[PDB]
mmCIF file with all atom_site columns, C-alpha atoms in Angstrom:
data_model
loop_
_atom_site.group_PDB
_atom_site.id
_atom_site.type_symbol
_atom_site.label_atom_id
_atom_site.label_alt_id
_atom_site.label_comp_id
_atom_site.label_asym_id
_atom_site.label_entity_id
_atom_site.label_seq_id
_atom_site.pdbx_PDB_ins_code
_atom_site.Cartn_x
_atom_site.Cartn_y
_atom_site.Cartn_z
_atom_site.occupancy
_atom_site.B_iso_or_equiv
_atom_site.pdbx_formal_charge
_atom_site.auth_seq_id
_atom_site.auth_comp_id
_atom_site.auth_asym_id
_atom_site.auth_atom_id
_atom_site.pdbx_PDB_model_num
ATOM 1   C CA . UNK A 1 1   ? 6.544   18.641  -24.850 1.00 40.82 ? 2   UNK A CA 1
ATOM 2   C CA . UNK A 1 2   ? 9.077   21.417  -24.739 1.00 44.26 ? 3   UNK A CA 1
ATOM 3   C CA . UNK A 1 3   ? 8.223   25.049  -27.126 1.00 46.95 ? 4   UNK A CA 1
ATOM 4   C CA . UNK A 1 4   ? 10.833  24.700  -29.563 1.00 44.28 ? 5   UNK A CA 1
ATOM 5   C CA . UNK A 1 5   ? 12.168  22.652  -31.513 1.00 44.46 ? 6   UNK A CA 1
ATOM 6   C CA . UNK A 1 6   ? 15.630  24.533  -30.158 1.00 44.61 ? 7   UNK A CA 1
ATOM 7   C CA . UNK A 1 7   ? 15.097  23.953  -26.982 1.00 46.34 ? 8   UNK A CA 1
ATOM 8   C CA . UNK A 1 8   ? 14.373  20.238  -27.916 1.00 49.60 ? 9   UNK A CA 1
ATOM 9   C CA . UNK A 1 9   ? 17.633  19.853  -29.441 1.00 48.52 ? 10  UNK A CA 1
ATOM 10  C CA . UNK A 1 10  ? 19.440  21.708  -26.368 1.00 46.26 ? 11  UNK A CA 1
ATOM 11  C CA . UNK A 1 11  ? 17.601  19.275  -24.093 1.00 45.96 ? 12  UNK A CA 1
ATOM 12  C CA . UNK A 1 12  ? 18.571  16.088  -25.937 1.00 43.22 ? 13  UNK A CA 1
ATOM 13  C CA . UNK A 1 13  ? 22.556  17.717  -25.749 1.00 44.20 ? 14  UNK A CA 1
ATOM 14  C CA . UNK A 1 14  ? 22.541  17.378  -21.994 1.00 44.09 ? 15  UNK A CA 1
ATOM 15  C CA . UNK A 1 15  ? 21.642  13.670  -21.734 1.00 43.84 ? 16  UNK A CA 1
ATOM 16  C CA . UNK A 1 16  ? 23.530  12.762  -24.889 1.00 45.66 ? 17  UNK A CA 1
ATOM 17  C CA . UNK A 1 17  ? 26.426  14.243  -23.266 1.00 46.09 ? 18  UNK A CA 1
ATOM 18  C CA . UNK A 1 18  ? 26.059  12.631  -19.749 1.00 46.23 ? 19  UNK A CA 1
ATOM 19  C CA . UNK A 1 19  ? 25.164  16.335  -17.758 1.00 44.81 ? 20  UNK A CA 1
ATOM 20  C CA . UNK A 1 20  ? 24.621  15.364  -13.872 1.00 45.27 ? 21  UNK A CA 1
ATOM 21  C CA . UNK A 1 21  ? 21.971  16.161  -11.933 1.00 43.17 ? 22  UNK A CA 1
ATOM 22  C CA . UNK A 1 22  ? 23.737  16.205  -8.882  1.00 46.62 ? 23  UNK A CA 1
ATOM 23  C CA . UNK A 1 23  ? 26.512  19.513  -9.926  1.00 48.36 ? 24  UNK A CA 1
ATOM 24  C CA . UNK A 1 24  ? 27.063  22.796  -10.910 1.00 48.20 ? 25  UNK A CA 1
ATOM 25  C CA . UNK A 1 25  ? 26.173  24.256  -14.360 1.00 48.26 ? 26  UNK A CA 1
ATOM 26  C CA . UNK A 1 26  ? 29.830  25.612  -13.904 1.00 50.74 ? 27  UNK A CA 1
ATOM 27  C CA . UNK A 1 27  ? 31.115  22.486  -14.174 1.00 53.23 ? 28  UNK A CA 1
ATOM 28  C CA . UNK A 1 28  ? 29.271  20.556  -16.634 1.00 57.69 ? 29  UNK A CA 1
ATOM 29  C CA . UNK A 1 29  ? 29.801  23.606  -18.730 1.00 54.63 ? 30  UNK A CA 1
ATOM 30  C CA . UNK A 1 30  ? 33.123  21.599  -20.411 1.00 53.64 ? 31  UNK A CA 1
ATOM 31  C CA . UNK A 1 31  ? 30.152  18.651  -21.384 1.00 53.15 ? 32  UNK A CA 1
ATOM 32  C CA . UNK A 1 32  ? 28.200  20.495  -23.730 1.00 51.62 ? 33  UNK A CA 1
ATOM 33  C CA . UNK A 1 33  ? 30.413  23.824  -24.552 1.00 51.79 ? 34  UNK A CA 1
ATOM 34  C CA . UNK A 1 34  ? 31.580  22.440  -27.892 1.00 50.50 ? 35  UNK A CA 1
ATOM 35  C CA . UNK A 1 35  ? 28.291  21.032  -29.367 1.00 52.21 ? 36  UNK A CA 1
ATOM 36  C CA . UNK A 1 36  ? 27.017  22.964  -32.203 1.00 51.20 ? 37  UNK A CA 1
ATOM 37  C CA . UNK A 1 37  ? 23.173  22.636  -30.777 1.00 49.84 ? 38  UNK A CA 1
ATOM 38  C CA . UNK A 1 38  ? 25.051  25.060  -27.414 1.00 46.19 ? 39  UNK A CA 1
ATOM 39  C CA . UNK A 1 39  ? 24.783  27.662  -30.064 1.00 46.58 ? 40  UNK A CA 1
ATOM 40  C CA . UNK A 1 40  ? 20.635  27.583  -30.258 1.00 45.79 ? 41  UNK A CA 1
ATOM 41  C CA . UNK A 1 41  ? 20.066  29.285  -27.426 1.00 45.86 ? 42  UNK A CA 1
ATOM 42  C CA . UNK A 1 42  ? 21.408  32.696  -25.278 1.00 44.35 ? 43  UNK A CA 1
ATOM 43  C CA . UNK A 1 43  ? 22.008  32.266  -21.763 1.00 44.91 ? 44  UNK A CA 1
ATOM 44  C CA . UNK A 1 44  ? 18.668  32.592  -19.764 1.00 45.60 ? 45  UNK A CA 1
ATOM 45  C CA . UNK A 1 45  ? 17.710  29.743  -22.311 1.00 49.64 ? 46  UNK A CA 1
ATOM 46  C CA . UNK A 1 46  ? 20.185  27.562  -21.718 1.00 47.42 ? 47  UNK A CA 1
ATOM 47  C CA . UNK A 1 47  ? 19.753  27.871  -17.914 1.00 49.51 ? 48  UNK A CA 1
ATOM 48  C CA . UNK A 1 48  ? 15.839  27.409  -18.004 1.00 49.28 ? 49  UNK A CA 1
ATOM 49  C CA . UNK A 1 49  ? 16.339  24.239  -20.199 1.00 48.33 ? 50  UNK A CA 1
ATOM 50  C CA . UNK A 1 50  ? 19.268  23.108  -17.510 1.00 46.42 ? 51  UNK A CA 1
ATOM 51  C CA . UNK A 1 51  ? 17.442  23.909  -14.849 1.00 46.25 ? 52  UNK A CA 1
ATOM 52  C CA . UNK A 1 52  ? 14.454  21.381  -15.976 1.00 45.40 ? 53  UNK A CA 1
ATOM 53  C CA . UNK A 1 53  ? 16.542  18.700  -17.168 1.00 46.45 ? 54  UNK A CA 1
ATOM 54  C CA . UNK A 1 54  ? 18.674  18.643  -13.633 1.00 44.15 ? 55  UNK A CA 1
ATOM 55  C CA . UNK A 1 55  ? 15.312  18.740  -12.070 1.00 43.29 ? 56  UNK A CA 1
ATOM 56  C CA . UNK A 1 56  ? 13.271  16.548  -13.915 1.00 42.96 ? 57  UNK A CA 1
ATOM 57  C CA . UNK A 1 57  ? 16.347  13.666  -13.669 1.00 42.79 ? 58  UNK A CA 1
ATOM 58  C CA . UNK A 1 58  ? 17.106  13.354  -10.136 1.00 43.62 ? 59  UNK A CA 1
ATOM 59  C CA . UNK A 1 59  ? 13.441  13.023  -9.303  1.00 44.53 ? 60  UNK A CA 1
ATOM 60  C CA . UNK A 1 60  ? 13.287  10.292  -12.096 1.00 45.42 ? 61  UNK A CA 1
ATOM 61  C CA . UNK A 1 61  ? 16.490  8.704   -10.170 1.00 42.53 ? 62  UNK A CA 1
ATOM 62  C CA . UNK A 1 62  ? 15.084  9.165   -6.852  1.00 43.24 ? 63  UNK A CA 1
ATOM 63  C CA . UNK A 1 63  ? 11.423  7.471   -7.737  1.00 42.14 ? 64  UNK A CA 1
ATOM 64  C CA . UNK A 1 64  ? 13.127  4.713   -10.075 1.00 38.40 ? 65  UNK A CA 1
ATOM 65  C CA . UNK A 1 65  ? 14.758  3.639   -6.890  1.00 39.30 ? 66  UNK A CA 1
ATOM 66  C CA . UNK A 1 66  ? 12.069  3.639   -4.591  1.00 36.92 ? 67  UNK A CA 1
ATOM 67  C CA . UNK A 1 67  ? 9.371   1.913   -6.452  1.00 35.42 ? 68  UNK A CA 1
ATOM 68  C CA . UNK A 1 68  ? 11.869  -0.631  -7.671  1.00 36.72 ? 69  UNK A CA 1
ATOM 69  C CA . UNK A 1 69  ? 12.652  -1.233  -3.488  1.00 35.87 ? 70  UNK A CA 1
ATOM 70  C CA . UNK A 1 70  ? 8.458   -0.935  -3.065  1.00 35.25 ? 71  UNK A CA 1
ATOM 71  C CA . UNK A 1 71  ? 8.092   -3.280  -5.896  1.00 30.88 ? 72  UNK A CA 1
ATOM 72  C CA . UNK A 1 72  ? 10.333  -5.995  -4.898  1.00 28.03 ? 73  UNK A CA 1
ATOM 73  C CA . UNK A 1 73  ? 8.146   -6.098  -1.776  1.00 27.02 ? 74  UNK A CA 1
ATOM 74  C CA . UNK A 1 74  ? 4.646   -6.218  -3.003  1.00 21.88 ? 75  UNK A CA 1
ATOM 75  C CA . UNK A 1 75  ? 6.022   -9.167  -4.805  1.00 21.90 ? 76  UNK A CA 1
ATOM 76  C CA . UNK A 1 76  ? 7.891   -10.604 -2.130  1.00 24.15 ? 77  UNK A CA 1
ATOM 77  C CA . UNK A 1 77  ? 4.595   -10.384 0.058   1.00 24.94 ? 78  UNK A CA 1
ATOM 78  C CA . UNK A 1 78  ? 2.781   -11.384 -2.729  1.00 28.26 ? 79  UNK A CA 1
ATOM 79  C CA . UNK A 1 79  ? 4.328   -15.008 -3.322  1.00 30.47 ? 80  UNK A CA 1
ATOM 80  C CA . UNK A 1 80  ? 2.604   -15.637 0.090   1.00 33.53 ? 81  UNK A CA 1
ATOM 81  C CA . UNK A 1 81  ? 12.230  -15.620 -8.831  1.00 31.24 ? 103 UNK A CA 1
ATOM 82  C CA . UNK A 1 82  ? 10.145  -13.562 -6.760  1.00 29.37 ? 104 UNK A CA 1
ATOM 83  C CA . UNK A 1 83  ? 12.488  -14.565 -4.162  1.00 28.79 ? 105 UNK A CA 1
ATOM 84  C CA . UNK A 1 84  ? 16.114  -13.908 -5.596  1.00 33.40 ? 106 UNK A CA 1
ATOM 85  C CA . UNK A 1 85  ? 14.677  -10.279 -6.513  1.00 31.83 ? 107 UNK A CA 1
ATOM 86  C CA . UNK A 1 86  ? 15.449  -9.554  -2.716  1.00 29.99 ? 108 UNK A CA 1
ATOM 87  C CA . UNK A 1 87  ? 19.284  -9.815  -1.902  1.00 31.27 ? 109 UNK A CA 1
ATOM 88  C CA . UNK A 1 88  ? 20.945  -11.417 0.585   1.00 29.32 ? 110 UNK A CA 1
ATOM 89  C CA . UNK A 1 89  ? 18.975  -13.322 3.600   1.00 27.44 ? 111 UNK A CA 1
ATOM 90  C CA . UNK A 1 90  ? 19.709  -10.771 6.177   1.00 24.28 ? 112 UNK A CA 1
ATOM 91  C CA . UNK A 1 91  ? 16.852  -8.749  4.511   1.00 22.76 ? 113 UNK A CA 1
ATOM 92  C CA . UNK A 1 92  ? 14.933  -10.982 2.770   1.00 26.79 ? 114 UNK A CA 1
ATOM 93  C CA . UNK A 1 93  ? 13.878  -12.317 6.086   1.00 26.06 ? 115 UNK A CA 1
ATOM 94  C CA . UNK A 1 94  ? 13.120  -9.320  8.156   1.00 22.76 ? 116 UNK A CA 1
ATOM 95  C CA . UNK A 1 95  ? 10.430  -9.255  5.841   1.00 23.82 ? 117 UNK A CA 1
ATOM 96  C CA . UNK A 1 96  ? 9.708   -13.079 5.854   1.00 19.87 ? 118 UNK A CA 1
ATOM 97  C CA . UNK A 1 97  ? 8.924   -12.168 9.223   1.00 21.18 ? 119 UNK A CA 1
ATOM 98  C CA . UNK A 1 98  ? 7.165   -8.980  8.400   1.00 18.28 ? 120 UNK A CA 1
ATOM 99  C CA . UNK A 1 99  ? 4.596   -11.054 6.752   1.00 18.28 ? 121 UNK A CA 1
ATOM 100 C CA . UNK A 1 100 ? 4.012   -13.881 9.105   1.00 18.85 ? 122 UNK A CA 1
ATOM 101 C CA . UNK A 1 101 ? 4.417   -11.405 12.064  1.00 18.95 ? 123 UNK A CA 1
ATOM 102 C CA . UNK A 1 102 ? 1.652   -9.454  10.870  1.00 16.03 ? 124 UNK A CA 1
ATOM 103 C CA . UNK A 1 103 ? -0.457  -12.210 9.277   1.00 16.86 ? 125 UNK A CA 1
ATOM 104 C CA . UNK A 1 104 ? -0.798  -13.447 13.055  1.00 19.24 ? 126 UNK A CA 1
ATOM 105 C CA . UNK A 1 105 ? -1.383  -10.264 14.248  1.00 21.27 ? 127 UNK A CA 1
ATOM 106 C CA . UNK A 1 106 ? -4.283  -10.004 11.917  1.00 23.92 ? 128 UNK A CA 1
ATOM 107 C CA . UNK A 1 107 ? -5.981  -12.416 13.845  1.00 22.88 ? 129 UNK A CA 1
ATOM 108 C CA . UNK A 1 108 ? -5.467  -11.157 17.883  1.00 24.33 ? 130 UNK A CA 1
ATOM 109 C CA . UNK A 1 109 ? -7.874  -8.896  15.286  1.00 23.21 ? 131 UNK A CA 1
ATOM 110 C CA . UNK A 1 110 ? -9.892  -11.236 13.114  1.00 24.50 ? 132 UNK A CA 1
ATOM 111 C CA . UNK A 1 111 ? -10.986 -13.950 15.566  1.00 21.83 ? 133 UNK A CA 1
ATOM 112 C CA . UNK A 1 112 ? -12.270 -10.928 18.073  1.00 24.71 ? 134 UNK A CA 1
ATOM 113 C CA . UNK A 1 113 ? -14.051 -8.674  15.789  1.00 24.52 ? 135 UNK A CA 1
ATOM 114 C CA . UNK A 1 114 ? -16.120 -11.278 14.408  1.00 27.13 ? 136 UNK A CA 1
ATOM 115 C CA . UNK A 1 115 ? -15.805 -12.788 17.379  1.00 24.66 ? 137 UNK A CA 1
ATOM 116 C CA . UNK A 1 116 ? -17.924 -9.579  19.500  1.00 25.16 ? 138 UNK A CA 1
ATOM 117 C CA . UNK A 1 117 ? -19.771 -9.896  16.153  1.00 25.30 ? 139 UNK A CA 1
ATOM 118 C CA . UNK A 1 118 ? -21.174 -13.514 16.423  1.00 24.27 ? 140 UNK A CA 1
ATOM 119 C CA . UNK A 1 119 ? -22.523 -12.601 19.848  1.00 22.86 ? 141 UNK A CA 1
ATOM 120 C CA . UNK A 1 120 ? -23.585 -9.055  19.226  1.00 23.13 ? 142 UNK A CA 1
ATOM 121 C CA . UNK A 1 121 ? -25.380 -10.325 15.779  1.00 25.27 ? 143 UNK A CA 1
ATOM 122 C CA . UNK A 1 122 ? -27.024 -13.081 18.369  1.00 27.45 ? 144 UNK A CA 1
ATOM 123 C CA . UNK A 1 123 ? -28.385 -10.098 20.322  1.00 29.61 ? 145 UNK A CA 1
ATOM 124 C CA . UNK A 1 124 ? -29.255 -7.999  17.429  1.00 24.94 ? 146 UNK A CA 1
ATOM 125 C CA . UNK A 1 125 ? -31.297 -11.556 16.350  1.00 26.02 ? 147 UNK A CA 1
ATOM 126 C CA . UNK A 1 126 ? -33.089 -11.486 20.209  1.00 28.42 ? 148 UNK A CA 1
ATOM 127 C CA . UNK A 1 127 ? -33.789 -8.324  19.895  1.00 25.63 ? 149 UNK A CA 1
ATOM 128 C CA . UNK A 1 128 ? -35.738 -8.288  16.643  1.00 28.74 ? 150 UNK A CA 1
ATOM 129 C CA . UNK A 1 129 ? -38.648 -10.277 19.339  1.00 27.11 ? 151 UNK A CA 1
ATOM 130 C CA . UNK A 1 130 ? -39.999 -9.128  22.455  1.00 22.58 ? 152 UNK A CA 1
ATOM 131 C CA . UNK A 1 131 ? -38.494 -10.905 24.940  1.00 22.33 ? 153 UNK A CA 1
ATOM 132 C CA . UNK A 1 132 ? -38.553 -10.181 28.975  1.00 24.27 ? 154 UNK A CA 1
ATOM 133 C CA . UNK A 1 133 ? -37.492 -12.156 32.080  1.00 22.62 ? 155 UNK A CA 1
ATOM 134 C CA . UNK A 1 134 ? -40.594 -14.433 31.510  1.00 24.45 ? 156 UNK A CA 1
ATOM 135 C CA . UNK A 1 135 ? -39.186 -15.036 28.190  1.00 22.88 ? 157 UNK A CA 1
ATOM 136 C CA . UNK A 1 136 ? -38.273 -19.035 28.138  1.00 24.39 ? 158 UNK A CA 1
ATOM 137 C CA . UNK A 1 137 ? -36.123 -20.978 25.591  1.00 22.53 ? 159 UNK A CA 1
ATOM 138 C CA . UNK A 1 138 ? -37.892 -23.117 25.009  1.00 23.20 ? 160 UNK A CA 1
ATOM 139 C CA . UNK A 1 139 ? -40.522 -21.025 23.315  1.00 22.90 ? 161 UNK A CA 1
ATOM 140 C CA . UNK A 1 140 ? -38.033 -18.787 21.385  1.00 22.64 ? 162 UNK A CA 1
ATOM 141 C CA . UNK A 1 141 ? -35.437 -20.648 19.616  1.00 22.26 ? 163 UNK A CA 1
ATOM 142 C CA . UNK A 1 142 ? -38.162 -22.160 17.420  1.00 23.10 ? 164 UNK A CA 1
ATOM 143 C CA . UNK A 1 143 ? -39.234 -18.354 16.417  1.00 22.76 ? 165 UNK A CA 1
ATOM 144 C CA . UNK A 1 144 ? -35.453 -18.107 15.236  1.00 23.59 ? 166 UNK A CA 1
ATOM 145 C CA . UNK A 1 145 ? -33.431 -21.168 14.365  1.00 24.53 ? 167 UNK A CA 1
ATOM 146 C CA . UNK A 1 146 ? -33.979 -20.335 10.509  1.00 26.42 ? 168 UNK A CA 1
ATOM 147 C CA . UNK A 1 147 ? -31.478 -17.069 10.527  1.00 26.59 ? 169 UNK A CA 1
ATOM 148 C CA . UNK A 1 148 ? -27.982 -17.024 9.900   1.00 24.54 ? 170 UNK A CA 1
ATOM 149 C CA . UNK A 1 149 ? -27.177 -15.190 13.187  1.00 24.13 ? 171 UNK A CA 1
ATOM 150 C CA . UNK A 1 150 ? -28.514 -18.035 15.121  1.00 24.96 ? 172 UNK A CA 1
ATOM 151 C CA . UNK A 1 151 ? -26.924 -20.636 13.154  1.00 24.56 ? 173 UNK A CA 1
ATOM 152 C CA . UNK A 1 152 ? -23.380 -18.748 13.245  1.00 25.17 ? 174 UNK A CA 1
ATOM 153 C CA . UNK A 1 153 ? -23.390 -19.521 17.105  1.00 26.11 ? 175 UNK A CA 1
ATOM 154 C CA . UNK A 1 154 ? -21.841 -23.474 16.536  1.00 25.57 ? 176 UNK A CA 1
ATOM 155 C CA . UNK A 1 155 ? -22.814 -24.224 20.602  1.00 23.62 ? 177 UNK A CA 1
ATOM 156 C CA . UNK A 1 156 ? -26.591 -25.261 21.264  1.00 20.75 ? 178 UNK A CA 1
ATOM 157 C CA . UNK A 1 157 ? -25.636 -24.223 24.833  1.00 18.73 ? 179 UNK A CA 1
ATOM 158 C CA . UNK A 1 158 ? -23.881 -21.696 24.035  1.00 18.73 ? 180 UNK A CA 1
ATOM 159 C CA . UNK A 1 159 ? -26.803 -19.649 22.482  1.00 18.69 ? 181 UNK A CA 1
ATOM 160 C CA . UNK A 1 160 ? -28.968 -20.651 25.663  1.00 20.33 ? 182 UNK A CA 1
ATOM 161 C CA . UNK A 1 161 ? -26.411 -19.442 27.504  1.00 21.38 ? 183 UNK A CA 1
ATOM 162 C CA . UNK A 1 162 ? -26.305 -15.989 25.573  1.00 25.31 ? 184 UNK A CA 1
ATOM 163 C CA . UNK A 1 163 ? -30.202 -16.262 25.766  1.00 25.90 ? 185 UNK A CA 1
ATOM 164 C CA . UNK A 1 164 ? -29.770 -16.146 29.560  1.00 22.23 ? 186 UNK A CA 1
ATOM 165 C CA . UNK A 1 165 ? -27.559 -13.058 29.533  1.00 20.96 ? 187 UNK A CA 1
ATOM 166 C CA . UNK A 1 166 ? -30.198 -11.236 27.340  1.00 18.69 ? 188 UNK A CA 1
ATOM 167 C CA . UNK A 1 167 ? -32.537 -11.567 29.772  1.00 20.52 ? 189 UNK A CA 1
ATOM 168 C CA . UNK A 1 168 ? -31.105 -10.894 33.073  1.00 19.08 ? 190 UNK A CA 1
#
């Protein structure tokens, strides 16, 4: 949404024309110089308009690459045609190993913080009662064998044994 309809036209000149983003007005000059729509506008004009069109392309170059590379990833990953996006092997498998290499290592995580989280729930359950050394077993898992942190521990001895620690 440029001001004028001028400018507009000056603006569409410079891509019709195939102006780089990546030079010197001074020698794209020889692109554009014999357009009638060069005529529209005096010199600060013409550089403003430049200015913004060299500008506004290379950052549409540079993201158009990027998020095309990002892309091809998060669909990559995400099959886990997809697969020929990627080229070669070479790289298409330092990211099949990206995946599995992390998808592994999201379990010396997952299996420990629910595993601290089984046992501290177990506690959290204990601690709901009033329970002392005299506390006995017996006597207790009956008050709490309905809840879900109870029933999460899958070893009957295991929760006595848990029971014990509580205590001591």
């Amino acid at each position: 949404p440029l001001g004028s309809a001028r400018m507009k036209q000056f603006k569409d000149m410079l891509l019709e024309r195939g102006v780089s983003a990546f030079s010197t007005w001074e020698k794209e000059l020889h692109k554009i110089v014999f357009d009638p729509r060069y005529l529209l506008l005096n010199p600060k004009e013409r550089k403003q308009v430049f200015d913004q069109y060299v500008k506004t392309r290379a950052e549409e170059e540079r993201r158009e690459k990027k998020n095309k590379i990002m892309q091809a990833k998060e669909d990559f990953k995400k099959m886990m045609s997809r697969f020929k996006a990627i080229e070669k092997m070479k790289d298409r498998e330092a990211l099949f190993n990206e995946f599995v290499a992390a998808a592994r290592k999201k379990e010396k995580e997952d299996s420990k913080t629910r595993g601290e989280k089984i046992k501290s729930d177990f506690f959290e359950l204990l601690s709901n009662h009033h329970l002392d050394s005299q506390s006995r077993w017996s006597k207790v898992k009956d008050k709490v064998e309905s809840d879900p942190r109870y029933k999460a521990v899958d070893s009957s001895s295991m929760r006595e044994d848990l029971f014990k620690q509580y205590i001591e």
